[PDB]
């Protein structure tokens, strides 16, 4: 499948090389190849997958925003719309690819809380990116799909993970962004961010120096958003 003939370990090694070279499209293709080998992913490998696709879709989102703004200013020839649609279609294909990997078959094989929450958070994230550009008869259903994925991830993380766990924190961070930016629920976003921050603060005393650094980094993003939102 382009990558079907390459060893899993070689795909992982090349994903790490691509990251060092800031070649994120390559990195994503290598990690897609590794997933399609059908074995579960380690914690490091899950992070490589996420880094690769987050950087790819990140460029597409940034481009889409530039073009949508130009298109909106033009509405105060068809080229701006056509080109925004091209980028949008490419973004939707990347999101569909990631959602396909999660559905076939990362999530169903993920039994541990750290893997299952990571993947369900990813599912919410890539439906959220779809929701950012959605405008037709599917925007509501896309939003509901993001919410459902995030909610299942939240339920597991609250049962199975400490409040300072960085996956749990990044999940709550992104679900709060979903509430604020997608779901027109800024009060829910603010409440979630506050409660997440305060419950992690009260658990920091249990952590090593390095774990403390990991958790407080994500907590600072919650604080930055609260400052932006209030």
């Amino acid at each position: 499948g382009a990558m079907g003939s390459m060893e899993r370990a070689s795909l992982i090694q090349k994903a790490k090389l691509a990251e060092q070279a800031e070649r994120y499209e390559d990195m994503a293709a290598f990690m897609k190849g590794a997933v399609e080998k059908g074995e579960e992913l380690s914690c490091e490998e899950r992070n490589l997958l996420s880094v690769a696709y987050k950087n790819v879709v990140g460029g597409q989102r940034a481009a889409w925003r530039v073009l949508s703004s130009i298109e909106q200013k033009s509405n105060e020839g068809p080229e701006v719309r056509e080109y925004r649609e091209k980028v949008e279609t490419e973004l939707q294909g990347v999101c569909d690819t990631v959602l396909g990997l999660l559905d076939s078959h990362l999530i169903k094989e993920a039994g541990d809380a750290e893997s299952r929450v990571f993947y369900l958070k990813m599912k919410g994230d890539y439906y959220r990116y779809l929701a950012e550009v959605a405008t037709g008869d599917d925007k509501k259903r896309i939003i509901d799909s993001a919410r459902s994925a995030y909610q299942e991830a939240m339920d597991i993380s609250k049962k199975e993970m400490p409040p300072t766990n960085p996956i749990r924190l990044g999940l709550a961070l992104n679900f709060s962004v979903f509430h604020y930016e997608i779901a027109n629920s800024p009060e829910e976003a603010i409440s979630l961010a506050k409660t997440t921050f305060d419950e992690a603060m009260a658990d920091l005393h249990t952590l090593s120096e390095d774990s403390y650094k990991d958790s407080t980094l994500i907590m600072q993003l919650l604080r930055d958003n609260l400052t932006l939102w209030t």
Partner: peptide
């Protein structure tokens, strides 16, 4: 405008 999570967590 709102900040979201880094890709890498743990």
């Amino acid at each position: 405008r709102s900040h979201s999570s880094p890709a890498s967590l743990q």
